Amino acid sequence: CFEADIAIPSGISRPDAAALQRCEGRVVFLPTIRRQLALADVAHESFVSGGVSPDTLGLLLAYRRRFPAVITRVLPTRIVACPVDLGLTHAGTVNLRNTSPVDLCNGDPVSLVPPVFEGQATDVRLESLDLTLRFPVPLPTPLAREIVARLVARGIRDLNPDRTPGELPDLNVLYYNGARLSLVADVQQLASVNTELRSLVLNMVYSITEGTTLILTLIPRLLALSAQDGYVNALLQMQSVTREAAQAPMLMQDGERRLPLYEALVAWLAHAGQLGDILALAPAVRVCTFDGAAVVQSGDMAPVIRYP
Amino acid sequence: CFEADIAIPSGISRPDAAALQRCEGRVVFLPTIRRQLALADVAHESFVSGGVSPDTLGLLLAYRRRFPAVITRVLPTRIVACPVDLGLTHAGTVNLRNTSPVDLCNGDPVSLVPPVFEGQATDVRLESLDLTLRFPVPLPTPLAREIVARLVARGIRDLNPDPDLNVLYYNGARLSLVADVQQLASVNTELRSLVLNMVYSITEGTTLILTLIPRLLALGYVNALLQMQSVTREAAQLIHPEAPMLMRRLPLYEALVAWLAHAGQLGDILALAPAVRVCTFDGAAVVQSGDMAPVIRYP
Amino acid sequence: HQPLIARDGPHPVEQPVHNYMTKVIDRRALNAAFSLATEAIALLTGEAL
Amino acid sequence: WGKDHQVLRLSMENAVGTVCHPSLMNIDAAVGGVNHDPVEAANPYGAYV
């Protein structure tokens, strides 16, 4: 299972060692694939770039680089976590401890997130040796991709910077099932928002091709369906730019045998289709429960299996 | 392998029991990996969600949410299927059945929804117990993605219509997409909902960037670098779409959120991540249609 | 330690639950008192006789 | 009915010790406590002079 041992340094007060006892099942990001490692390479003090702690869009970029490892067991002088990015090859399914208001279901791919909710408990200060541990929040990729979009746009709109009055939309609040989820709005850093904006802008461009114009012809046709089907009605969100975009072939066919529709789909599907993944870290795990329990309560251990 | 044993219901007709015997080597999606599962839980009548039988999109959703397990041994009063997702990678070779193109010595078969090909063909109904089984088609990832995108495009043309996407040349002989008749009307009616989510996510993506780029870079390195490599590409596409179309940071940003999600939800549905690979040995190296093929758990 | 019921159907298969706890002893005190008048203490030890 | 029969009578004049005190006209906590998180522009039609 190529487990990576992590040595607890010196002595962390009996209260600190009792804190690590309950950190089994949580996730660690190690900056290498190793066999021998120091406890301080995992700590949040290692996430610190030159002089500065990354913001909460900076962590996503730090969790982009390095490797998520789920702690399996904790011994008196070492921490055993098997690096999911590599050593995921277990016959059965390493335990992930659901730390989140959310609930997994069965089959939900699980991507991680820096802690981001209004009410949260990810500090775990260890006083004997100066270091701390922020554990990422596991979360279904549908929800984790909605969050990243919220953080990206919040860092971006603020950056315009919106000219328009000082009362903007929410973008800080979600819903998963019921349960309003309030994100933490705190700091946005130039460099962290740039790259997130840079790669967002960059990829949405490559998803536009010659055949794409053939699709833009269909906007008036969509709104014809906006209104005579109950689906397709639902599809178009009320705040739909497309709705505002309608408020065409152009000849120019280069010999007629290319099939730009097909080629336009492929192009869009690659770059724009895969945006959750490039903006954030893609799922590497998905909940699976052998006992046939079909959800995972918040705080429980989710049996987890390799990539969706 | 972790076999999971599906329980055949009460007395079934002798012709139905022979229908199942021929289903060994077929892919099943099992909702949970419980060792004991019913047959009704696997049957296609268990894919109903909104009160309807799912379309090709509703299927592809479910195929991404439950666990496919190949059928290993069919026994009277039990079906033994070994889930593809469980165990170590590159182990538990279990035999598949090839359907359509060859499945050469590798290529990571994807199990894509049945309707993409002869629709009802593969329904395999069991009348005695009143259930049915639609087995996904095991196609290689490059070809599975080429097809599923190939049909969506045909769908778009069909959406408003006034070079054949259909003819496919795979390996030795030209493959055929169209079954003509009204099958297309049945194929096109099930891709109907997948086509729209595709049409929408494009039209909603462009107009959202075409509004954002000119409503950004006008408020640093953002500006210069953007227009730099976008020369005659993004900007040209901006003037041309704004030519045959219409033109709000606050709705912009809140629509950029809702699109960004819906987009990646389609990238997940789509791309048909491979369930398995073919790695043969002391074998033909090409599995002819309808022949059991070796297969292993990870690409 | 708690029993089980082996159970057919889709109901999830059940693990024997074992259970552990400690209760902390709680404390109090009682007190009464009494007194001796100075004329009594004078008597109780010699003194006056 | 009070204790021991005794039919009684609360009346509004009874509320004088409550509502006739200048605890009635103090709102600084309200207006300042609802001030946080600024609200949307409301067509200050009846709100403007």
PDB file of C-alpha atoms in Angstrom, chain A residues 66-299:
ATOM      1  CA  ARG A  66       1.468  17.984  -3.748  1.00  0.00           C
ATOM      2  CA  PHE A  67      -0.415  14.745  -2.900  1.00  0.00           C
ATOM      3  CA  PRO A  68      -3.626  14.120  -0.843  1.00  0.00           C
ATOM      4  CA  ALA A  69      -3.101  11.323   1.597  1.00  0.00           C
ATOM      5  CA  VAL A  70      -5.799  10.032   3.914  1.00  0.00           C
ATOM      6  CA  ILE A  71      -4.539   9.175   7.370  1.00  0.00           C
ATOM      7  CA  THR A  72      -5.106   5.440   8.012  1.00  0.00           C
ATOM      8  CA  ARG A  73      -3.647   4.986  11.516  1.00  0.00           C
ATOM      9  CA  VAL A  74      -1.705   7.102  14.021  1.00  0.00           C
ATOM     10  CA  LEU A  75       1.098   5.549  16.145  1.00  0.00           C
ATOM     11  CA  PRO A  76       3.030   7.027  18.990  1.00  0.00           C
ATOM     12  CA  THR A  77       5.904   8.157  16.817  1.00  0.00           C
ATOM     13  CA  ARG A  78       4.519   8.069  13.273  1.00  0.00           C
ATOM     14  CA  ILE A  79       1.390   8.862  11.230  1.00  0.00           C
ATOM     15  CA  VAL A  80       0.439   6.434   8.482  1.00  0.00           C
ATOM     16  CA  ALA A  81      -1.296   7.884   5.439  1.00  0.00           C
ATOM     17  CA  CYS A  82      -1.351   6.129   2.048  1.00  0.00           C
ATOM     18  CA  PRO A  83      -1.031   8.607  -0.846  1.00  0.00           C
ATOM     19  CA  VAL A  84      -4.326   8.278  -2.741  1.00  0.00           C
ATOM     20  CA  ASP A  85      -2.765   9.869  -5.818  1.00  0.00           C
ATOM     21  CA  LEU A  86      -0.594   6.729  -6.009  1.00  0.00           C
ATOM     22  CA  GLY A  87      -1.028   4.071  -3.350  1.00  0.00           C
ATOM     23  CA  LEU A  88      -4.777   3.798  -3.742  1.00  0.00           C
ATOM     24  CA  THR A  89      -4.299   0.133  -4.622  1.00  0.00           C
ATOM     25  CA  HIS A  90      -6.019  -1.618  -1.771  1.00  0.00           C
ATOM     26  CA  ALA A  91      -8.391  -4.479  -2.260  1.00  0.00           C
ATOM     27  CA  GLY A  92     -11.063  -2.864  -0.160  1.00  0.00           C
ATOM     28  CA  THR A  93     -11.494   0.785   0.383  1.00  0.00           C
ATOM     29  CA  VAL A  94      -9.637   3.155   2.788  1.00  0.00           C
ATOM     30  CA  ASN A  95     -11.806   5.078   5.327  1.00  0.00           C
ATOM     31  CA  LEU A  96     -12.437   8.766   4.768  1.00  0.00           C
ATOM     32  CA  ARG A  97     -13.844  10.661   7.609  1.00  0.00           C
ATOM     33  CA  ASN A  98     -16.602  12.912   6.424  1.00  0.00           C
ATOM     34  CA  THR A  99     -15.810  16.348   7.815  1.00  0.00           C
ATOM     35  CA  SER A 100     -18.417  18.676   6.367  1.00  0.00           C
ATOM     36  CA  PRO A 101     -22.032  19.728   6.900  1.00  0.00           C
ATOM     37  CA  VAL A 102     -22.698  17.718   3.736  1.00  0.00           C
ATOM     38  CA  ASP A 103     -23.465  14.043   3.207  1.00  0.00           C
ATOM     39  CA  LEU A 104     -21.991  11.834   0.770  1.00  0.00           C
ATOM     40  CA  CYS A 105     -24.668   9.442  -0.692  1.00  0.00           C
ATOM     41  CA  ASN A 106     -23.278   6.460  -2.566  1.00  0.00           C
ATOM     42  CA  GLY A 107     -21.165   6.809  -5.648  1.00  0.00           C
ATOM     43  CA  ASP A 108     -20.526  10.517  -5.085  1.00  0.00           C
ATOM     44  CA  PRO A 109     -17.020  11.346  -6.277  1.00  0.00           C
ATOM     45  CA  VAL A 110     -15.205  13.112  -3.467  1.00  0.00           C
ATOM     46  CA  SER A 111     -13.002  16.112  -4.151  1.00  0.00           C
ATOM     47  CA  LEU A 112     -11.473  18.075  -1.337  1.00  0.00           C
ATOM     48  CA  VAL A 113     -11.734  21.764  -0.455  1.00  0.00           C
ATOM     49  CA  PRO A 114      -9.911  24.072   1.982  1.00  0.00           C
ATOM     50  CA  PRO A 115     -12.098  24.676   4.933  1.00  0.00           C
ATOM     51  CA  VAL A 116     -14.674  27.153   3.622  1.00  0.00           C
ATOM     52  CA  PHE A 117     -17.857  27.298   5.684  1.00  0.00           C
ATOM     53  CA  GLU A 118     -19.122  30.061   7.954  1.00  0.00           C
ATOM     54  CA  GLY A 119     -19.178  27.756  10.972  1.00  0.00           C
ATOM     55  CA  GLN A 120     -16.094  25.547  10.881  1.00  0.00           C
ATOM     56  CA  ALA A 121     -13.661  23.602  13.042  1.00  0.00           C
ATOM     57  CA  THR A 122     -10.341  23.105  11.273  1.00  0.00           C
ATOM     58  CA  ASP A 123      -7.633  24.481  13.527  1.00  0.00           C
ATOM     59  CA  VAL A 124      -6.075  21.643  15.480  1.00  0.00           C
ATOM     60  CA  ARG A 125      -3.301  23.738  17.084  1.00  0.00           C
ATOM     61  CA  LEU A 126      -0.499  21.683  18.593  1.00  0.00           C
ATOM     62  CA  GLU A 127       1.340  23.782  21.155  1.00  0.00           C
ATOM     63  CA  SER A 128       4.304  21.550  22.046  1.00  0.00           C
ATOM     64  CA  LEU A 129       5.848  21.941  18.633  1.00  0.00           C
ATOM     65  CA  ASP A 130       4.925  24.888  16.675  1.00  0.00           C
ATOM     66  CA  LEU A 131       2.653  23.605  14.000  1.00  0.00           C
ATOM     67  CA  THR A 132      -0.958  23.325  12.964  1.00  0.00           C
ATOM     68  CA  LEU A 133      -3.071  21.223  10.679  1.00  0.00           C
ATOM     69  CA  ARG A 134      -5.908  22.405   8.470  1.00  0.00           C
ATOM     70  CA  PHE A 135      -7.702  19.474   7.172  1.00  0.00           C
ATOM     71  CA  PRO A 136      -9.441  19.832   3.824  1.00  0.00           C
ATOM     72  CA  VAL A 137     -13.197  19.373   3.676  1.00  0.00           C
ATOM     73  CA  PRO A 138     -14.289  16.375   1.592  1.00  0.00           C
ATOM     74  CA  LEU A 139     -17.301  17.151  -0.549  1.00  0.00           C
ATOM     75  CA  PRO A 140     -19.153  15.796  -3.579  1.00  0.00           C
ATOM     76  CA  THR A 141     -17.687  17.107  -6.800  1.00  0.00           C
ATOM     77  CA  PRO A 142     -21.045  18.691  -7.763  1.00  0.00           C
ATOM     78  CA  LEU A 143     -20.868  20.749  -4.590  1.00  0.00           C
ATOM     79  CA  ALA A 144     -17.112  21.283  -4.578  1.00  0.00           C
ATOM     80  CA  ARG A 145     -17.324  22.634  -8.124  1.00  0.00           C
ATOM     81  CA  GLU A 146     -20.151  24.978  -7.173  1.00  0.00           C
ATOM     82  CA  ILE A 147     -17.993  26.340  -4.353  1.00  0.00           C
ATOM     83  CA  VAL A 148     -14.892  26.910  -6.452  1.00  0.00           C
ATOM     84  CA  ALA A 149     -17.057  28.764  -8.951  1.00  0.00           C
ATOM     85  CA  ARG A 150     -18.283  30.920  -6.067  1.00  0.00           C
ATOM     86  CA  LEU A 151     -14.769  31.695  -4.858  1.00  0.00           C
ATOM     87  CA  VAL A 152     -13.513  32.347  -8.382  1.00  0.00           C
ATOM     88  CA  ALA A 153     -16.332  34.716  -9.289  1.00  0.00           C
ATOM     89  CA  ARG A 154     -16.160  36.448  -5.912  1.00  0.00           C
ATOM     90  CA  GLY A 155     -12.458  37.067  -6.392  1.00  0.00           C
ATOM     91  CA  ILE A 156     -13.178  38.216  -9.979  1.00  0.00           C
ATOM     92  CA  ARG A 157     -16.203  40.504  -9.748  1.00  0.00           C
ATOM     93  CA  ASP A 158     -14.579  42.244  -6.818  1.00  0.00           C
ATOM     94  CA  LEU A 159     -11.596  42.694  -9.130  1.00  0.00           C
ATOM     95  CA  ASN A 160     -13.339  44.679 -11.900  1.00  0.00           C
ATOM     96  CA  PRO A 161     -13.990  46.284  -9.647  1.00  0.00           C
ATOM     97  CA  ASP A 162     -17.759  46.840  -9.785  1.00  0.00           C
ATOM     98  CA  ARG A 163     -18.848  51.463 -11.308  1.00  0.00           C
ATOM     99  CA  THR A 164     -22.130  49.845 -10.317  1.00  0.00           C
ATOM    100  CA  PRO A 165     -23.287  50.417  -6.708  1.00  0.00           C
ATOM    101  CA  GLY A 166     -21.788  48.739  -3.659  1.00  0.00           C
ATOM    102  CA  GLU A 167     -24.469  46.077  -3.198  1.00  0.00           C
ATOM    103  CA  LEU A 168     -23.574  43.022  -5.282  1.00  0.00           C
ATOM    104  CA  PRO A 169     -25.222  39.567  -5.450  1.00  0.00           C
ATOM    105  CA  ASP A 170     -24.649  36.933  -2.791  1.00  0.00           C
ATOM    106  CA  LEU A 171     -22.313  34.343  -4.358  1.00  0.00           C
ATOM    107  CA  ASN A 172     -21.243  33.610  -0.788  1.00  0.00           C
ATOM    108  CA  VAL A 173     -24.184  31.296  -0.030  1.00  0.00           C
ATOM    109  CA  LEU A 174     -25.140  27.864  -1.382  1.00  0.00           C
ATOM    110  CA  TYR A 175     -27.748  25.197  -0.799  1.00  0.00           C
ATOM    111  CA  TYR A 176     -27.075  21.474  -0.702  1.00  0.00           C
ATOM    112  CA  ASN A 177     -30.436  19.732  -0.313  1.00  0.00           C
ATOM    113  CA  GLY A 178     -31.859  22.030   2.362  1.00  0.00           C
ATOM    114  CA  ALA A 179     -29.267  23.581   4.620  1.00  0.00           C
ATOM    115  CA  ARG A 180     -28.069  26.990   3.492  1.00  0.00           C
ATOM    116  CA  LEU A 181     -24.279  26.845   3.325  1.00  0.00           C
ATOM    117  CA  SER A 182     -22.498  30.146   3.902  1.00  0.00           C
ATOM    118  CA  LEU A 183     -18.990  30.336   2.478  1.00  0.00           C
ATOM    119  CA  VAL A 184     -16.226  32.256   4.205  1.00  0.00           C
ATOM    120  CA  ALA A 185     -15.620  35.604   2.513  1.00  0.00           C
ATOM    121  CA  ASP A 186     -12.285  36.897   3.747  1.00  0.00           C
ATOM    122  CA  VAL A 187      -9.397  37.771   1.521  1.00  0.00           C
ATOM    123  CA  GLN A 188      -8.647  37.443  -2.106  1.00  0.00           C
ATOM    124  CA  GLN A 189      -5.059  37.651  -3.271  1.00  0.00           C
ATOM    125  CA  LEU A 190      -3.914  39.059  -6.583  1.00  0.00           C
ATOM    126  CA  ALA A 191      -1.863  36.034  -7.603  1.00  0.00           C
ATOM    127  CA  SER A 192      -4.420  33.501  -6.402  1.00  0.00           C
ATOM    128  CA  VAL A 193      -7.254  35.151  -8.322  1.00  0.00           C
ATOM    129  CA  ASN A 194      -5.106  35.841 -11.390  1.00  0.00           C
ATOM    130  CA  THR A 195      -4.250  32.209 -12.134  1.00  0.00           C
ATOM    131  CA  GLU A 196      -7.829  31.158 -11.413  1.00  0.00           C
ATOM    132  CA  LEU A 197      -9.002  33.912 -13.756  1.00  0.00           C
ATOM    133  CA  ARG A 198      -6.170  33.284 -16.204  1.00  0.00           C
ATOM    134  CA  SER A 199      -7.016  29.613 -16.707  1.00  0.00           C
ATOM    135  CA  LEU A 200     -10.758  30.275 -16.709  1.00  0.00           C
ATOM    136  CA  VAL A 201     -10.460  32.879 -19.464  1.00  0.00           C
ATOM    137  CA  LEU A 202      -7.900  30.800 -21.326  1.00  0.00           C
ATOM    138  CA  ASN A 203      -9.975  27.623 -21.527  1.00  0.00           C
ATOM    139  CA  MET A 204     -13.310  29.233 -22.360  1.00  0.00           C
ATOM    140  CA  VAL A 205     -11.597  30.666 -25.443  1.00  0.00           C
ATOM    141  CA  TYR A 206     -10.282  27.350 -26.764  1.00  0.00           C
ATOM    142  CA  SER A 207     -13.824  25.969 -26.552  1.00  0.00           C
ATOM    143  CA  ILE A 208     -14.884  28.315 -29.378  1.00  0.00           C
ATOM    144  CA  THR A 209     -14.302  27.083 -32.932  1.00  0.00           C
ATOM    145  CA  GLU A 210     -15.573  27.640 -36.455  1.00  0.00           C
ATOM    146  CA  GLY A 211     -18.364  25.116 -35.993  1.00  0.00           C
ATOM    147  CA  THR A 212     -19.346  26.939 -32.805  1.00  0.00           C
ATOM    148  CA  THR A 213     -20.958  29.700 -34.866  1.00  0.00           C
ATOM    149  CA  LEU A 214     -23.270  27.027 -36.255  1.00  0.00           C
ATOM    150  CA  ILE A 215     -24.454  26.474 -32.683  1.00  0.00           C
ATOM    151  CA  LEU A 216     -24.891  30.166 -31.857  1.00  0.00           C
ATOM    152  CA  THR A 217     -27.461  30.152 -34.662  1.00  0.00           C
ATOM    153  CA  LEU A 218     -29.641  28.037 -32.371  1.00  0.00           C
ATOM    154  CA  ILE A 219     -30.153  30.581 -29.565  1.00  0.00           C
ATOM    155  CA  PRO A 220     -33.432  31.900 -31.052  1.00  0.00           C
ATOM    156  CA  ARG A 221     -34.430  28.266 -31.449  1.00  0.00           C
ATOM    157  CA  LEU A 222     -33.667  27.510 -27.797  1.00  0.00           C
ATOM    158  CA  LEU A 223     -35.923  30.280 -26.544  1.00  0.00           C
ATOM    159  CA  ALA A 224     -38.631  28.869 -28.792  1.00  0.00           C
ATOM    160  CA  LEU A 225     -38.334  25.836 -26.517  1.00  0.00           C
ATOM    161  CA  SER A 226     -37.881  28.044 -23.433  1.00  0.00           C
ATOM    162  CA  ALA A 227     -41.610  28.478 -23.665  1.00  0.00           C
ATOM    163  CA  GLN A 228     -43.372  25.408 -25.057  1.00  0.00           C
ATOM    164  CA  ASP A 229     -41.847  22.575 -23.009  1.00  0.00           C
ATOM    165  CA  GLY A 230     -41.608  22.332 -19.251  1.00  0.00           C
ATOM    166  CA  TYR A 231     -38.090  21.022 -19.572  1.00  0.00           C
ATOM    167  CA  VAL A 232     -35.915  23.274 -21.658  1.00  0.00           C
ATOM    168  CA  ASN A 233     -37.756  25.737 -19.646  1.00  0.00           C
ATOM    169  CA  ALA A 234     -36.040  24.615 -16.525  1.00  0.00           C
ATOM    170  CA  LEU A 235     -32.796  24.253 -18.442  1.00  0.00           C
ATOM    171  CA  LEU A 236     -32.480  27.962 -19.074  1.00  0.00           C
ATOM    172  CA  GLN A 237     -31.785  29.430 -15.665  1.00  0.00           C
ATOM    173  CA  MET A 238     -33.752  32.557 -14.888  1.00  0.00           C
ATOM    174  CA  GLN A 239     -30.528  34.489 -14.800  1.00  0.00           C
ATOM    175  CA  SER A 240     -29.421  33.232 -18.164  1.00  0.00           C
ATOM    176  CA  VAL A 241     -27.184  35.336 -20.258  1.00  0.00           C
ATOM    177  CA  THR A 242     -28.358  33.339 -23.258  1.00  0.00           C
ATOM    178  CA  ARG A 243     -31.818  34.759 -22.576  1.00  0.00           C
ATOM    179  CA  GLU A 244     -30.229  38.208 -22.597  1.00  0.00           C
ATOM    180  CA  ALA A 245     -28.065  37.213 -25.575  1.00  0.00           C
ATOM    181  CA  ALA A 246     -31.104  36.957 -27.847  1.00  0.00           C
ATOM    182  CA  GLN A 247     -32.581  40.256 -26.623  1.00  0.00           C
ATOM    183  CA  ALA A 248     -25.988  33.366 -39.259  1.00  0.00           C
ATOM    184  CA  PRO A 249     -24.245  30.423 -41.011  1.00  0.00           C
ATOM    185  CA  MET A 250     -22.052  33.022 -42.775  1.00  0.00           C
ATOM    186  CA  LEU A 251     -21.445  30.704 -45.692  1.00  0.00           C
ATOM    187  CA  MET A 252     -17.700  30.376 -45.352  1.00  0.00           C
ATOM    188  CA  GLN A 253     -17.694  26.581 -45.448  1.00  0.00           C
ATOM    189  CA  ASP A 254     -14.216  25.348 -46.353  1.00  0.00           C
ATOM    190  CA  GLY A 255     -14.917  22.716 -49.029  1.00  0.00           C
ATOM    191  CA  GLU A 256     -17.713  21.116 -47.072  1.00  0.00           C
ATOM    192  CA  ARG A 257     -16.032  18.093 -45.706  1.00  0.00           C
ATOM    193  CA  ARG A 258     -14.674  18.753 -42.214  1.00  0.00           C
ATOM    194  CA  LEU A 259     -17.758  18.237 -39.998  1.00  0.00           C
ATOM    195  CA  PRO A 260     -17.291  21.331 -37.834  1.00  0.00           C
ATOM    196  CA  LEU A 261     -20.206  20.448 -35.544  1.00  0.00           C
ATOM    197  CA  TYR A 262     -18.524  17.250 -34.370  1.00  0.00           C
ATOM    198  CA  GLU A 263     -15.167  19.007 -34.177  1.00  0.00           C
ATOM    199  CA  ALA A 264     -16.760  21.879 -32.251  1.00  0.00           C
ATOM    200  CA  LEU A 265     -18.171  19.502 -29.636  1.00  0.00           C
ATOM    201  CA  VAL A 266     -14.860  17.728 -29.092  1.00  0.00           C
ATOM    202  CA  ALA A 267     -13.097  21.072 -28.750  1.00  0.00           C
ATOM    203  CA  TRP A 268     -15.636  22.454 -26.290  1.00  0.00           C
ATOM    204  CA  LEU A 269     -15.817  19.196 -24.363  1.00  0.00           C
ATOM    205  CA  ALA A 270     -12.076  19.071 -23.720  1.00  0.00           C
ATOM    206  CA  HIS A 271     -11.405  22.637 -22.635  1.00  0.00           C
ATOM    207  CA  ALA A 272     -14.704  23.940 -21.288  1.00  0.00           C
ATOM    208  CA  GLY A 273     -16.111  20.584 -20.213  1.00  0.00           C
ATOM    209  CA  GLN A 274     -13.175  19.990 -17.918  1.00  0.00           C
ATOM    210  CA  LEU A 275     -13.209  23.126 -15.875  1.00  0.00           C
ATOM    211  CA  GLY A 276     -13.991  21.857 -12.393  1.00  0.00           C
ATOM    212  CA  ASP A 277     -10.834  19.757 -12.668  1.00  0.00           C
ATOM    213  CA  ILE A 278      -8.530  22.525 -13.879  1.00  0.00           C
ATOM    214  CA  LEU A 279      -9.898  25.207 -11.579  1.00  0.00           C
ATOM    215  CA  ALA A 280      -9.966  22.793  -8.651  1.00  0.00           C
ATOM    216  CA  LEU A 281      -8.646  19.360  -7.795  1.00  0.00           C
ATOM    217  CA  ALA A 282     -10.645  16.605  -9.433  1.00  0.00           C
ATOM    218  CA  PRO A 283     -12.123  13.696  -7.518  1.00  0.00           C
ATOM    219  CA  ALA A 284      -9.874  10.761  -6.898  1.00  0.00           C
ATOM    220  CA  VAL A 285     -12.294   8.872  -4.689  1.00  0.00           C
ATOM    221  CA  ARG A 286     -16.008   8.070  -4.623  1.00  0.00           C
ATOM    222  CA  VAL A 287     -18.098   6.831  -1.710  1.00  0.00           C
ATOM    223  CA  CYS A 288     -18.770   3.103  -1.711  1.00  0.00           C
ATOM    224  CA  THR A 289     -20.254   1.263   1.213  1.00  0.00           C
ATOM    225  CA  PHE A 290     -20.133  -2.534   1.325  1.00  0.00           C
ATOM    226  CA  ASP A 291     -22.536  -2.893   4.242  1.00  0.00           C
ATOM    227  CA  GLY A 292     -25.178  -1.336   2.021  1.00  0.00           C
ATOM    228  CA  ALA A 293     -25.598   1.825   4.057  1.00  0.00           C
ATOM    229  CA  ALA A 294     -26.426   4.244   1.276  1.00  0.00           C
ATOM    230  CA  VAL A 295     -25.280   7.561   2.796  1.00  0.00           C
ATOM    231  CA  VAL A 296     -22.561   8.794   5.134  1.00  0.00           C
ATOM    232  CA  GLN A 297     -23.637  11.029   7.974  1.00  0.00           C
ATOM    233  CA  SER A 298     -21.524  14.090   8.634  1.00  0.00           C
ATOM    234  CA  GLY A 299     -18.740  13.041  10.970  1.00  0.00           C
TER     235      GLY A 299
END
